């Protein structure tokens, strides 16, 4: 295994997908206030 190189790639990518999902949650949340 090479935990350091996997960690760095996974965290860059995971932080983009998690950020995308929070923006969606924000969009749904605002849309539930209509």
């Amino acid at each position: 295994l090479d935990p350091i190189d996997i960690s760095i790639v996974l965290n860059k990518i995971k932080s983009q997908l998690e950020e995308s999902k929070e923006w969606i949650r924000r969009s749904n949340k605002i849309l539930d206030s209509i």
Partner: protein, 43 residues
């Protein structure tokens, strides 16, 4: 009121657009890693 709702949809869509951009940045990073990996295979 109805102006308010329109305003809300605009805020919600801007947030969706930001979701799409950050997903795009995810795919660009992953693409780079896939090409780093063919190079690793080749070498």
């Amino acid at each position: 009121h109805l102006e308010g709702e329109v305003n809300k949809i605009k805020s919600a869509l801007l947030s969706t657009n930001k979701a799409v951009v950050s997903l795009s940045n995810g795919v660009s990073v992953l693409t780079s890693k896939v090409l780093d990996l063919k190079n690793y295979i080749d070498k």
